[PDB]
Structures are given as structure tokens and as C-alpha cells.
Design a protein around this ligand. Structure first.
Ligand SMILES: N[C@@H](Cc1ccccc1)C(=O)O
Length: 406
């Protein structure tokens, strides 16, 4: 029966109460833009690889980062969440925000879903590069599929302290208390040196990519799988924008994988955000077009070329509002955004939820959304926008159970 199973790459996934993949999102699996020669996301991947191969120093010799850029994005919820100490009630698990094949399997929402497995295989240094998947809003800075680069680097005790003359007393581990600055089983000596290595390598990487005009800052933050943790923000177009999260790996995670004689750092870089800043790319949909006007601008002889995408003129937009009554107590905005992606695809530039109200006589909730139809590569005709918008109205009633207003 329709809707009972999803098949992907030869495997079958029975559908249940968690299942929420759209056909549209599934058609993106395997595209692997980060492996497409000359693609801007591939360019960033290659430049990061070169950084660690040529410009990262280790006191015992540079670790050698093995690179995994072709792992299937289908993961278990154990890989994506439990292995990273993400609590069962954590909002990052909500059905509204993740593409679940079912209660047990999902499309990975982050490349951190592979940390535990690669640590458990015994690696001390690795990169993971891949497409990741999240349910989210529609605008020029958000897409249901994007790409991350994960890095993990572990140190042994004498490796971390190798530059210290009287360092035989120094330890990685102790039994004390957790503070804002360190985990309960880490010494402050070890945390300071791991943090220094992590921030130094990331600063050097960004300085190479952007030059020394770059304005960056570190923001103290929280993740369940690192502590202390930071985000790096870059000041771009007058605002501070996060480009990566990182930190000192939680020792329970590292110990659980079998590396109890190691302390580590890890980071996760958003490739599209970096590429949009670095290359003057104004809209995330451009990564997904095959327009030779776009792809030819990144075919460079040296991966370190300072290319500046020259954008096309903006084409005219058609703006249409759409309003409906929500079903009785079963609806997420992201269900509508998924349907917009399904029907309108890359014709849709942005969707804003403008108005919401409750009607007293019926107790129903009305939403009104504003849809900006504007294509990156061509002028949309009024007629074709009308036909797409009509299809959207009809699909919302049929599939989401809404009752149309206008
Ligand atoms: N996985 C985190 C980023 C991260 C990776 C590794 C360590 C810390 C943070 C994210 O997707 O936002």
C-alpha cells in the first residue's frame, strides 16, 4: 500500500508515526555536491583537507586525518543522538525538525552522527564531509539539505604535554567538578592546551581562506557532546554569523568508544555558510543549479584561487499570500514548508508566516503565509506562478488537511 514503506539504496524502511520524508528530499540523496569536482562546496572541502595535510603541526608528528566523504546519510537515532549524549527529551529530536525514515532510522542532521563509530574503529584523527538534512524555514539562507565538515582530533597524555620540560607530573584526567570551564574528569592543564590547539588551528584555517582582513570572534556556547564549547562567528554584511561549532569532546563519549587514554577536540563546519561568505554567493539555491553561468566560475587551476562569483541580475518576483484553517490539533509550520518545497521547488525564494489567529466561534486556528516566487535563473511568468500556487492550495487541503481561506 502507498506510504507503507520507503526504499532507498536497496534498503527498505517500514513507515510509522515518526516517518516524515518527502519524495522531494529523497531525490537529493546521493547528489553529493561536496564530491563534485570544481563545485564550491568541494572546493572548500579540498582546501580544509590541504590545511590539515600541509599546515597542521603535531608534536609527535601530524596525526594524518583520514577523510570520509561518501558515508550514506541514513543513520540510526542512536548514531545521530544517543551516541552524542543528546537527552531523550531534547528539542533537537523533534519530528518537526528532522527527516525520520521511521522511529529508528533518519537522514543524519549533522556529521557528528559518525563521531562514535569512527572513534570506535580506533582513529585518532578524521574528517567527515557530507550532506545533512533538517526540516526548516524557506529563505535564501536555508535549504533542507546542506553540507558539513566534521573534524575530530585526539591527543595522548605525553603528546599533549610534549613541549614541557618538567611535565611528567601533568595529567589529562582527575576526579573533580564540572565548571563553566571544564568537565569533571579533565584537568585544567589539559583543557587549556586542547582549547589552544583547537582555536589556533581554526583561526589559521580561516585566515588562509579569507586573508587577514577577516573579523572573527569566539562565542561560548553549549552542546551535549562537547564541553567547554564554542561557536566561531564571522562578521559579514554588518552582522555576526555563526560558521562552526566546536569544543573539547565529552569524555563519556570518548570513553564509550574505547579511547579512554585520549582527550579530544571536535568541530563541525557549515559548508554553505562558509561558501556564501567566501565566494559572494547570495542565495543557497545556487549550489543546486546546473547553470553553466554559475559552475564555470569555480573551475580553477589552484584550489586556493580567490574567486568572486558574479551574480546575475535579480529577476522579478511574484508575491502571493495563502491562508487556511489548521487541522484539529495536528500541524507544524515545517509540514507546510516541506509541501512548498515539493510543489514549488526552487521557484520559491522565501515563505513568511505573516498572521495567525483563533476564531472564537469555531476554536480553529488560521495561518496566513506570504510566498515569494522568484527564480534565480529566469523570469517566472504570471501564468506559471498561478499554476504552481493553485497546485499548492490544492495539495495543502489534500495532504495537510487544511481548510482553505484564500
Ligand atoms: N554538530 C554540531 C556542530 C558541532 C560539531 C562538533 C563539535 C561541536 C559542535 C552542529 O551541527 O551544530
Amino acid at each position: 500500500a502507498p506510504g507503507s514503506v520507503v526504499e532507498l539504496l536497496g534498503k527498505s524502511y517500514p513507515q510509522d508515526d515518526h516517518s516524515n520524508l518527502t519524495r522531494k528530499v529523497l531525490t537529493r540523496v546521493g547528489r553529493n555536491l561536496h564530491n563534485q569536482q570544481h563545485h564550491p562546496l568541494w572546493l572548500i572541502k579540498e582546501r580544509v583537507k590541504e590545511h590539515f595535510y600541509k599546515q597542521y603541526v603535531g608534536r609527535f608528528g601530524t596525526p594524518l586525518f583520514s577523510v570520509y566523504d561518501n558515508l550514506s546519510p541514513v543513520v540510526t537515532t542512536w548514531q545521530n543522538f544517543d551516541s552524542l549524549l543528546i537527552p531523550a527529551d531534547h528539542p533537537s529530536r523533534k519530528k518537526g525538525d528532522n527527516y525520520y525514515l521511521n522511529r529508528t532510522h533518519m537522514l543524519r542532521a549533522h556529521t557528528s552522527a559518525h563521531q562514535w563509530d569512527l572513534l570506535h574503529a580506533g582513529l585518532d584523527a578524521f574528517l567527515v564531509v557530507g550532506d545533512v538534512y533538517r526540516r526548516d524555514q524557506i529563505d535564501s539562507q536555508h535549504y533542507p539539505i546542506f553540507h558539513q565538515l566534521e573534524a575530530v582530533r585526539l591527543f595522548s597524555k605525553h603528546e599533549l604535554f610534549a613541549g614541557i620540560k618538567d611535565g611528567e607530573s601533568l595529567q589529562l584526567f582527575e576526579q573533580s567538578s564540572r565548571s563553566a570551564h571544564k568537565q569533571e574528569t579533565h584537568t585544567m592543564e589539559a583543557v587549556k592546551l586542547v582549547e589552544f590547539d583547537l582555536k589556533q588551528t581554526l583561526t589559521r584555517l580561516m585566515a588562509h581562506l579569507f586573508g587577514d582582513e577577516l573579523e572573527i570572534r569566539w562565542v561560548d556556547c553549549y552542546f551535549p557532546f562537547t564541553h567547554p564549547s564554542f561557536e566561531m562567528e564571522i562578521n559579514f554584511h554588518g552582522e555576526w554569523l555563526e560558521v562552526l561549532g566546536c569544543g573539547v569532546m565529552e569524555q563519556q563519549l570518548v570513553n564509550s568508544a574505547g579511547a579512554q587514554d585520549r582527550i579530544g577536540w571536535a568541530f563541525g563546519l557549515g559548508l554553505e555558510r562558509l561558501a556564501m561568505i567566501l565566494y559572494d554567493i547570495p542565495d543557497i539555491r545556487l549550489f543546486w543549479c546546473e547553470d553553466e553561468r554559475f559552475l564555470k566560475q569555480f573551475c580553477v587551476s589552484n584550489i586556493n584561487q580567490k574567486v568572486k562569483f558574479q551574480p546575475l541580475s535579480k529577476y522579478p518576483a511574484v508575491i502571493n499570500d495563502i491562508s487556511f484553517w489548521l487541522p484539529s490539533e495536528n500541524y507544524a509550520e515545517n509540514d507546510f514548508y516541506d509541501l512548498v518545497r515539493t510543489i514549488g521547488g526552487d521557484l520559491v525564494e522565501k515563505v513568511d508566516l505573516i498572521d495567525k489567529f483563533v476564531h472564537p466561534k469555531t476554536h480553529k486556528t488560521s495561518h496566513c503565509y506570504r510566498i515569494t516566487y522568484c527564480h534565480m535563473e529566469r523570469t517566472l511568468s504570471q501564468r506559471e506562478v498561478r499554476h504552481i500556487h493553485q497546485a499548492l492550495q490544492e495539495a495543502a487541503v489534500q495532504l495537510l488537511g487544511v481548510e482553505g481561506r484564500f
